[PDB]
Amino acid sequence: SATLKVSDSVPAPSDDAEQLRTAFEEDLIISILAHRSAEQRKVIRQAYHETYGEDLLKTLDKELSNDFERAILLWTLEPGERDALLANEATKRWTSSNQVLMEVACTRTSTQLLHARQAYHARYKKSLEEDVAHHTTGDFRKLLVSLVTSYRYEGDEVNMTLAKQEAKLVHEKIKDKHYNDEDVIRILSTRSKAQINATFNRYQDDHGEEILKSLEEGDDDDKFLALLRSTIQCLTRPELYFVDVLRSAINKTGTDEGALTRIVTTRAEIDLKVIGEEYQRRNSIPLEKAITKDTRGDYEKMLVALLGEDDA
Numbered sequence: 001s002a003t004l005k006v007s008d009s010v011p012a013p014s015d016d017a018e019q020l021r022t023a024f025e026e027d028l029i030i031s032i033l034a035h036r037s038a039e040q041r042k043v044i045r046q047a048y049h050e051t052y053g054e055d056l057l058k059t060l061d062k063e064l065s066n067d068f069e070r071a072i073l074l075w076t077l078e079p080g081e082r083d084a085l086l087a088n089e090a091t092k093r094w095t096s097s098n099q100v101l102m103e104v105a106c107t108r109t110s111t112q113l114l115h116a117r118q119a120y121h122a123r124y125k126k127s128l129e130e131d132v133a134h135h136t137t138g139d140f141r142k143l144l145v146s147l148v149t150s151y152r153y154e155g156d157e158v159n160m161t162l163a164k165q166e167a168k169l170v171h172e173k174i175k176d177k178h179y180n181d182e183d184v185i186r187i188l189s190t191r192s193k194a195q196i197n198a199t200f201n202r203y204q205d206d207h208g209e210e211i212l213k214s215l216e217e218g219d220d221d222d223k224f225l226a227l228l229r230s231t232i233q234c235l236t237r238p239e240l241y242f243v244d245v246l247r248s249a250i251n252k253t254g255t256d257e258g259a260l261t262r263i264v265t266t267r268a269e270i271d272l273k274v275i276g277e278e279y280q281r282r283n284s285i286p287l288e289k290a291i292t293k294d295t296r297g298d299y300e301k302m303l304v305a306l307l308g309e310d311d312a
Contacts (some may be wrong), residue, residue, distance in 0.1 A: 001270065001272075001274055001275050002268065002269050002270060002272060002273055003173035003272040003273045003276060003306070003308040004034075004035075004037075004268045004272070004306065004308065005035055005039050005266050005308045005310075006036060007034055007035050007036070007078075010036060010040050012046050013043040013046070013047040013048075013291045014047045014051065016032050016036070016040075016044045016047075017044055017047045017048035017051055017052075017056075018051070019032065020032060020033075020048065020056065020102065021051070021052060024056070024059075026068075026298045027083070027301075028299075029072065029302075030301060030302050030310070031074070031268050031300075032044075033075065033076060034075075034302060034305040034306050034310070037269070038078065038079060038269065041076060042078060042155075045057065045076065056076070057073060057076060057077065058259075060072055060076075061071045061073055061085075063218050064235065066299065067258075067261060067299040068297065068298040068302055069259060070261055070299075071261045071265060071299060071301070071302045071303060071306075073085075074086075074261060074262065074265045074266070075227065075265040075268075075306065076268075078115075079115065079269075079282060080112070080115030080116055080118065080119045081119045081267075082118055082265070082266070083104055083108070083112070083115070083116040083119070083266075084119035084120045084122075084123055084124070084128075085123075086100060086104055087101075087104050087116050087119075087120055087128050087132070087148075088120065088123075088124060090104075090123055091131045091134070091135045091136070092135070092221075094135045094136055094192060096137070096138075096139060096140050096223045096224070097223055097255060098256075099226070099227050099256075100256065100262075101132060101136070101144040101147070101148060102143070102144060102147055102227055102230055102231050102234060103241075104116060104148075104149045105144070105147040105150065105231070106147055106230075106231055106234035106235045107197050107234045107235075107241065107242075109154060110151055110153075111152050113148075113150070114151065116128065117148075118195065128147065128148050128258040129145065129149050132144055132145050132148050133145045134236050139180040139224050140223075140224060141181075142180075142185060143185060143224075143227060143228075143231070144227075146185050146186075146189045147188075147189055150189050150190060150191065152191070152192055152193065153191075153289060154192060154193065154194075155191045155192055155194060156192075156194045157192060157194060157195065158194055158195060158198040158246070159195065160198065160200075160202065160265050162195075163195070163198050163201075164202045164206060165198040166183065166187050166199060167199050167200070167202040167203035167206060168189065168206075169183055169184075170183065170184045170199075170203065171203060171206075171207065171214075174214045174215070177218060178214070178216060178219070179215075179222070179224060179225045179228050180224060184228075184277075187199065188231060188232075188235060193235060193236075196235055196236065197263040198238055200232075200236065202205070211232055212229060212233070214233055215228070215229055215232075219241065227305045238271060239271050239275040239277075240266075240276040240296045242263050242267060242272075243275055243278045243279045243282055244270075244282075245259050245263055246259075246260065246263065246275075246279060246287065246290070247279075247282060249281060250290050250291065252291070260291070261299075261303065263275075264303050265306060265309065268306045268307070272306075272307065273308075275287075276288075276307065286309075286312070287307065288304050288307050288309040289312060290312030291303050291304055291307075291312070292304055292312050299306050
């Protein structure tokens, strides 16, 4: 699942901070942070702030910034505050094409999303809800708002009878092309992930083709269905959603800014290893090589080091 390679023996935080201070005044910054855990790094900032009276991030936290720097920020922030920045940039420059709101909302557990929601308050004196329903429009808004306000139950419980009925209902709607039906929304927003897969297992048993296959009839450029599609991979098999965000960007075709870094850093300590496995399959090339393709500066180097393969 996780690719991050942590030292089975880590030094003292004050010493990591000292070296980092010196490295900040590259291969050293990577040899440390790209091999520490969420806590060990936390302490670092903490012990770093004590020593020099100055947060190592208040300096790198900025819009116009170098990709290597960006990769230092997103990764060094606590996972909760690292999503708040994303749960905030997506709303500033939002477009019906920006699915980064569904991503953070559907690829996160219940607790992790509570941290993001309990971090959008602190750093923004606002809620993630009000801003989402503030800057988004139409059906995209009804979905993005519905998804970001969820606090799903995370158990195994499966109501097979409800699974078929709603699978039936969602099935009828996909037929008439009502990809924006209120019911499809309610289900994929309040049911346990055990209930979402079980429903689609019913949708695939009681029909034949995978849910995503059903979608193969929507309008030519329907930008909402695209949101649904991801909300089907992000909630079912995230790794199978991340590989497709990687393949694009790496090809330089995507319209998502920072998709590459926004994913490596976030999933490194989660399911990056699976994502990677599911990557080589779709590309016939190890992700580490796809990234170190044409360029290999400190930024591409940090990206790969977070993948484990520091020397790719």
